[PDB]
From Swiss-Prot, chain A:
It comes from the Eukaryota. Histone demethylase that can demethylate both 'Lys-4' (H3K4me) and 'Lys-9' (H3K9me) of histone H3, thereby acting as a coactivator or a corepressor, depending on the context. Acts by oxidizing the substrate by FAD to generate the corresponding imine that is subsequently hydrolyzed. Acts as a corepressor by mediating demethylation of H3K4me, a specific tag for epigenetic transcriptional activation. Demethylates both mono- (H3K4me1) and di-methylated (H3K4me2) H3K4me. May play a role in the repression of neuronal genes. The SWIRM domain may act as an anchor site for a histone tail. It comes from Homo sapiens. The gene is KDM1A. It is found in: Nucleus; Chromosome. The chain holds residues 111 to 119 of 852 of the full protein. Belongs to the flavin monoamine oxidase family. Ubiquitously expressed. Component of a histone demethylase complex with RCOR1. Component of a RCOR/GFI/KDM1A/HDAC complex. Interacts directly with GFI1 and GFI1B. Interacts with INSM1 (via N-terminus). Component of a BHC histone deacetylase complex that contains HDAC1, HDAC2, HMG20B, KDM1A, RCOR1 and PHF21A. The BHC complex may also contain ZMYM2, ZNF217, ZMYM3, GSE1 and GTF2I. In the complex, RCOR1/CoREST strongly enhances the demethylase activity and protects it from the proteasome while PHF21A/BHC80 inhibits the demethylase activity. Interacts with the androgen receptor (AR). Acetylated by KAT8 in epithelial but not in mesenchymal cells, thereby regulating the epithelial-to-mesenchymal transition. Acetylation by KAT8 reduces KDM1A association with nucleosomes, thereby decreasing histone H3 demethylation, leading to transcription activatio of target genes. This is Lysine-specific histone demethylase 1A. Induction: Down-regulated during neural differentiation in neuroblastoma cancer.
From Swiss-Prot, chain B:
Heterodimer; with KPNB1. Component of a complex containing CSE1L, RAN and KPNA2. Interacts directly with CSE1L. Interacts with PLAG1. Interacts with APEX1 (via N-terminus). Interacts with FRG1 (via N-terminus). Interacts with ARL4A, CTNNBL1 and NBN. Interacts with ANP32E. Interacts with SNAI1 (via zinc fingers). Interacts with SNAI2 (via zinc fingers). Interacts with BAG6. Interacts with AIFM2; this interaction likely mediates the translocation of AIFM2 into the nucleus upon oxidative stress. Interacts with RSL1D1. Ubiquitinated. Deubiquitinated by USP22; leading to stabilization and increased activity. This is Importin subunit alpha-1. ARM repeats lie at residues 1-40, 41-80, 81-122, 129-173, 175-211, 212-251, 254-293, 296-338, 339-385, 386-425. Residues 71-167 are annotated as: NLS binding site (major). Residues 244-332 are annotated as: NLS binding site (minor). Belongs to the importin alpha family. One of its GO terms (biological process) is protein import into nucleus. The lineage of its organism: Eukaryota, Metazoa, Chordata, Craniata, Vertebrata.
Length: 9, 425
């Protein structure tokens, strides 16, 4: 699982 | 438009004394941070914008600037530890926790997401999020009769953030925080969305990655049957964490291991030990190695489920890391098994694949293998068959490999090598 996630477009 | 602003222009708008100018500039910053590869996170930080964004989180009368600032800060917090630290240092944790109660679901969701990135940095920020009181309002968002009434993306972000509050060690999360979260985790673990199930399994895998008291609080909640079902899933993203969790659990006590067996886990291992994904094979064999280290009745259940031929198979052909776990599974089996269980091992064909692995340039597998051969000879002695076994080993090129190891740069290798060659050959 990802430790951090950007909200991208 | 709000597309392709310079940082200088964003600064000019955010420093205006005009909330609507500030909103447009915050949106332009959000779009830099979300629509570019190589987003200019450090430039935004160096401009001093984080404290402004954090204060916008509090603008209850302008929900759009709350949302845009929350998204900009989410993506800053998604970067390096230094970038996440700048968000924390601006006061963002309590401001986001206050936004969990927003009547606008998209704003509450963005706050959930941002707190997940902060907690995901590591144990210190995780525990700091917990100390600011994040768990109660997070769990309150999932306190509905049926999870299916929540938006799917919303539930996925909530599950993911909760999994980061279960994640990391040195130290592990506070015991009281785990007990508070577990009932909700068990509920998410029965939900019919594959991404929620995957992140729920990851969280359980983190919580069982520790000493036996940690494993016990998870097992006591009755999740092992559901983990075993998810072990059977077709989705690799679900099987991988379910298997990690089961593997952790069987590092506990023999009674904790027995719960995995009673739930039916061993019936899934023919497929796991032949799985086309190398990492599944490796973690399944690691799991087997901690089951054959148990009691003789637990070894017997490995035998009854037909798994010894599957261990022979992976010892014969697999990725080397998997073959090493299989060697460990065999040494544990031979150290704890009855004579009849050890005889059965040899009748299944263990000797030849074991001997061929003494050609490995890896010192540790050599010792493990030599220790298993020793244990197998000790079983033959009790039967007076050390001779038939010596022949088997010589007949497949084993003696030659054992001989070569008498000249080995390692201490315990050539000592154990020599002892076998003399006492039996």
């Amino acid at each position: 699982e990802r430790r951090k996630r950007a909200k991208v477009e | 438009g709000t597309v392709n602003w310079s940082v200088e222009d964003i600064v000019k708008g955010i420093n205006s004394n005009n909330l609507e100018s500030q909103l447009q500039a915050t949106q332009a910053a959000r779009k830099l941070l979300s629509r570019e590869k190589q987003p200019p996170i450090d430039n935004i930080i160096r401009a001093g914008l984080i404290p402004k964004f954090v204060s916008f989180l509090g603008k209850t009368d302008c929900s759009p600037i709350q949302f845009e600032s929350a998204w900009a800060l989410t993506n800053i917090a998604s970067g390096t530890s230094e970038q996440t630290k700048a968000v924390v240092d601006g006061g963002a944790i309590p401001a986001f926790i206050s936004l969990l109660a927003s009547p606008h679901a998209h704003i509450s969701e963005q706050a959930v997401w941002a707190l997940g990135n902060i907690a995901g940095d590591g144990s210190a920020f995780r525990d700091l999020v917990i100390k600011h009181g994040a768990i109660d309002p997070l769990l309150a968002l999932l306190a509905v009769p049926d999870l299916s009434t929540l938006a799917c993306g919303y539930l996925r972000n909530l599950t993911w953030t909760l999994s980061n509050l279960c994640r990391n060690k040195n130290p592990a999360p506070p015991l009281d925080a785990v007990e508070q979260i577990l009932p909700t985790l068990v509920r998410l673990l029965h939900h019919n969305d594959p991404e929620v199930l995957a992140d729920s399994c990851w969280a359980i895998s983190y919580l069982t990655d520790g000493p036996n008291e940690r494993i016990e609080m998870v097992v006591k909640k009755g999740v092992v049957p559901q983990l075993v079902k998810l072990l059977g899933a077709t989705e690799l993203p679900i099987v991988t964490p379910a298997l990690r969790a089961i593997g952790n659990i069987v590092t506990g006590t023999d009674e904790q291991t027995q719960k995995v067996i009673d739930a039916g886990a061993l019936a899934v291992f023919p497929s796991l030990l032949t799985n086309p994904k190398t990492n599944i094979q490796k973690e399944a064999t690691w799991t087997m190695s901690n089951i054959t280290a148990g009691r003789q009745d637990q070894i017997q259940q490995v035998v009854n489920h037909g798994l010894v031929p599957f261990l022979v198979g992976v010892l014969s052909k697999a990725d080397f890391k998997t073959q090493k776990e299989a060697a460990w599974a065999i040494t544990n089996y031979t150290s704890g098994g009855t004579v009849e269980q050890i005889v059965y091992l040899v009748h299944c064909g263990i000797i030849e694949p074991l001997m061929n692995l003494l050609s490995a340039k890896d010192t540790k597998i050599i010792q493990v293998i030599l220790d298993a051969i020793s244990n197998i000879f000790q079983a033959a002695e009790k039967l007076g068959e050390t001779e038939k076994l010596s022949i088997m080993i010589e007949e497949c090129g084993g003696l030659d490999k054992i001989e070569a190891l008498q000249r080995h740069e390692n201490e315990s290798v050539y000592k154990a090598s020599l002892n076998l060659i003399e006492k039996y050959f």
